[PDB]
Design a protein around this ligand. Structure first.
Ligand code: MG
Ligand code: MG
Lengths: 56, 119, 60, 123
RNA sequence: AGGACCGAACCGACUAAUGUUGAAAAAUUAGCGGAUGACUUGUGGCUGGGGGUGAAAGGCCAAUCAAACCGGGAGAUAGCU
RNA sequence: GCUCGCCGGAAGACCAAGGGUUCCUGUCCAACGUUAAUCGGGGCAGGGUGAGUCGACCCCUAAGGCGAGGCCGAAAGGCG
RNA sequence: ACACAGGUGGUCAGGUAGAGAAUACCAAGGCGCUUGAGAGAACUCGGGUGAAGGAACUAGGCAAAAUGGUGCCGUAACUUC
RNA sequence: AAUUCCUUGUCGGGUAAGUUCCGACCUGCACGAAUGGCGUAAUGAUGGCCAGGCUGUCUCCACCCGAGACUCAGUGAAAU
RNA sequence: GCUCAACGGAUAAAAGGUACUCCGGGGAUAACAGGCUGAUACCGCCCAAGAGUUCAUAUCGACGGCGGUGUUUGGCACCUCGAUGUCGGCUCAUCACAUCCUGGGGCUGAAGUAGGUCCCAAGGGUAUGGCUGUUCGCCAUUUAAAGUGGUACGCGAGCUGGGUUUAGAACGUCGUGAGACAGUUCGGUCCCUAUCUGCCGUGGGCGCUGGAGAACUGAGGGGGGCUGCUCCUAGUACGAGAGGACCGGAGUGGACGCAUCACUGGUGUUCGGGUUGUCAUGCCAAUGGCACUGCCCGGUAGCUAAAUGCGGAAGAGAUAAGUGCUGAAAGCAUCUAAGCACGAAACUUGCCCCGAGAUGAGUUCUCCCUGACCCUUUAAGGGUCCUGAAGGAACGUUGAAGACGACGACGUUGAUAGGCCGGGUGUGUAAGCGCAGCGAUGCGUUGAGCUAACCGGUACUAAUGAACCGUGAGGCUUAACCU
């Protein structure tokens, strides 16, 4: 229900051990607008797989 | 478990899943491309990719499921008059999915759904 | 066995209630008079004995 | 599949009308029994003068089940009435004589060659 | 005609699940009883603590009642922790 | 803006009581808002309530409250 | 003590169905209730359906299930009629 | 017996089986006549007992519908 | 001048109730539980008066005697009173052996059948209801049997709250009374989001001394083990008959567990039909929203049991009790002492599952890497420029895989989903058009129309070029070979 002792801050490191984030490995570069974007996602400009998939 | 099943609850009851794809498919036919979330595109691949099966071929009696879960007849007048003859030879796959970043206020994964022959 | 007098853990948590029966005839005799079971068992020894003298008597 | 507390009808001319199973027999911890089976029953309703009496405790064989008995083709045989034929407690033979309604082929045995010979209809 | 009848509002709170760091310092959801009278509810008015009031249960008197609250005697007194 | 959904002897309109700027515009997003907020009953700055007939006041009076004198009571006061 | 599932008096009474100010669906009118978005395990909270059996369950048919309107026929004990 | 210790008194009923209940039995441990006695239609969110109907109460649980739980963002307590 | 007699004498002078209660404190002191103790209790043993016709010792055992158990009632007041929640139930249990069923024996006052008692044996099995808060018990009817105990007389941060044990109320009873009753009867709030330990699952890290991909071996651990009945042997043995077997064999059950959806069903709010009231689609005709999915009627896939397949072994070893064989000590006798055989659901195996973090990190099988230099505290050294393999992760499509993770399938060469065609499937003969009928409605097209999860196909869409990660022949020591 509730603890009987104060937990050690060293345990607090051990509980937060697996709690770390994870960044992106590599960004998919466009081949026409020539810019990095998310793999299997469109660019910020509206490009995907080279072509202009959406006029913004 | 949901072995061999098919259907996402979408955290909504079935009467609202009914009534939401009314307007969502009801406006995609209008503007030919819209911004929605990706599970409301991926469950909508069980919905809108069959809601273009709605858009196959004109009779008189085929004006009616496109009244039924749509409450609309103007969009009926767009489908079999213009879009039926548009997609006259495509045997499936009338759409395309564009995962377009995340929604601001809740980090919801958005996407663009659209038609294949938009231009 | 236990009696079901009022008091609880003085009553129900002890074996203050006795029952003495007969092997060849089958004549039970209980007692729950005082708190002690030997104020009951030995009393139920007397009451079965009081039945026992009547067994020849009621028959005859 | 008849458990306790189950009202059954009567299939012979014994005299009872309503019986009720109080014990499933024939096996250790045997929770259920279908046709071809023996149950201890009481009698809840009888005719004003018959072979029986309201409250007699005796055995019976189960002959018609609403639940169903299967055959090796896959065909399951259900009924619309749950009736039984009353037996002796000791000789364990049927007491009545005139069998009412149809019965099944699972009922036939050396113990029950007697009933099917008196049955009006055997499937 | 009725301290009549079924039953809304209204009024009560009998059962059950909830809830028990709550939506809520007693409530909701389902039902329930009364619902033309010994009815219910406004606006005021009056009764003050060994007193009040009470179809009475030590009930109620500003979320507190076998002696209200606030201030003072008063740093009551404590062979007790 | 387009549908959709709910309430509808109300989740609509209207007052008293009570609140006392919340009202209307402009501006701002630190805090406040159980998240963001470009928004707000938030901040800031401006506005905005017009009466012989409506209400109060006012003229009556009830329960009641006070009380000249008056009566009673150590005093304070009690009753009228 | 909160932008609190509470409490708070008066006035107002559209349509269809309906005895009705019940209920339903609605109009006028007003809102979608201040975290969302996923996933579709146990597990509780609510719900719906259930073979055969029908109280055996249990302290206890608790709750659930069931009954339900309007006419008409018919209606026992007993009665303080 | 809302009163009876013994006491599950005895008998009858009821049930397959009834420490309950309903009839008697009177041996009233320790009823009793306005701190009333006995009876009583109607009445009761009153106590106990029995039946029909009814059904996941149960045998013996299965399956779906939602609200959380779990995943990700934003915020972010508690008793100890 | 005082039974100041509670007699070193609180006052001349003083009774109660409190379950409406309250403070101050106490494990200095009660009630449960633990503790010690074992009187009592329970369970054995010794003696043998005798009973048992005779015959103590088949069966029993007077009078007595000796132990064991902690298990009854107790004793004690050591833990706990700045809290250790108790009766019964329910849910789950687990242990003991002093064994209830099953197993193995010995003796019998054991013909058989059936028992009696004793010993071995704890693998597995070991009722439902009526009554009552129940426990217990009685009863009914089962069963192979309905074991007994340890467990805070197991189990309330799991449930229940009937009983006891608050305040309300009443009787009987007691007291003048307020009130009280191991007297009853009616009514009466069961809180806690889990830090740790423990447990059930499921991951991450690093390790196993070049790296990677696999297959395993199996240390060790777990699961599992029940039984009736019928028939044969056989009416055989036995017995006078009645009755009725051993052993061996077959069949079918019960109960349990695993697997499963072909069947038989349930469910199937996403398939379909019927239908009520209302609202809207200009209006009819059609639909649709809402009304618990509005109310029904049904049904695919899936999930499911009540639906159907297995499962308990046989076998081996070593044995327990027990039976022996040779055989001295002990010219005989003698299962023991030397030797030696048999002997049970216990044991170890045989059965399945887990399993090399088995740090003792094992095994075999396959793939990858054969670039350059500086530094000084010269080595399992540090750094720099080329190189980036096997493969890996990441990302997307996804799953009869899943809380997440993990797992599995697939990413254009491609069938991974979705879509599409084909098919089946299920509601049950659509709409519109005719036709008849005053009409409601019926008939013609008509298993038509529709069709969720499904079966066969289809690249129609969505599964991206890359990049990332991991590198560049792998310590020392002898040893053995080869040169
Ligand atoms: Mg942490
Ligand atoms: Mg012994």
């Amino acid at each position: 229900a509730v603890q009987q002792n104060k937990p050690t801050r060293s345990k607090r490191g051990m509980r937060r051990s697996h709690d770390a984030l994870t960044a992106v490995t590599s960004l998919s570069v466009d081949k026409t607008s020539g810019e990095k974007h998310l793999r299997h996602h469109i660019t910020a400009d509206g490009y995907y797989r080279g072509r202009k998939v959406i006029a913004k | 478990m949901r072995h061999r099943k098919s259907g996402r609850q979408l955290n909504r009851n079935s009467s609202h899943r009914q009534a939401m794809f009314r307007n969502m498919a009801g406006s995609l036919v209008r503007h030919e491309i819209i911004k929605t979330t990706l599970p409301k595109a991926k469950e909508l691949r069980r919905v809108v990719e069959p809601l273009i099966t709605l858009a196959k071929t004109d009779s008189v009696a085929n004006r009616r499921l496109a009244f039924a879960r749509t409450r609309d007849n103007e969009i009926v007048a767009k489908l079999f008059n213009e879009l039926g003859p548009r997609f006259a030879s495509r045997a499936g796959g009338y759409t395309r999915i564009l995962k377009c970043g995340f929604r601001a206020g809740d980090n919801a994964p958005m996407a663009y759904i659209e038609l294949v022959d938009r231009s | 066995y236990r009696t079901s007098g009022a008091g609880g853990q003085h009553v129900n948590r002890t074996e203050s209630a006795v029952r003495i029966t007969h092997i060849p005839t089958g004549i039970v005799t209980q007692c729950q008079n005082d708190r002690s079971q030997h104020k009951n068992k030995d009393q139920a020894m007397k009451q079965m004995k009081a039945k026992l003298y009547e067994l020849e008597m009621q028959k005859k | 599949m008849i458990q306790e507390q189950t009202m059954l009808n009567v299939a012979d001319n014994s005299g009872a009308r309503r019986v009720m199973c109080i014990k499933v027999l024939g096996g250790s911890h045997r929770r259920y029994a279908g046709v071809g089976d023996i149950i201890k029953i009481t009698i809840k309703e009888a005719i004003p003068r018959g072979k029986v009496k309201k409250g007699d405790v005796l055995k019976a064989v189960v002959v018609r089940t609403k639940k169903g008995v299967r055959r090796p083709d896959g065909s399951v045989i259900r009924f619309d009435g749950n009736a039984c034929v009353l037996l002796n407690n000791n000789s364990e033979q049927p007491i009545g004589t005139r069998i009412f309604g149809p019965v099944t082929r699972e009922l036939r045995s050396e113990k029950f060659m007697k009933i099917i010979s008196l049955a009006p209809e055997v499937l």
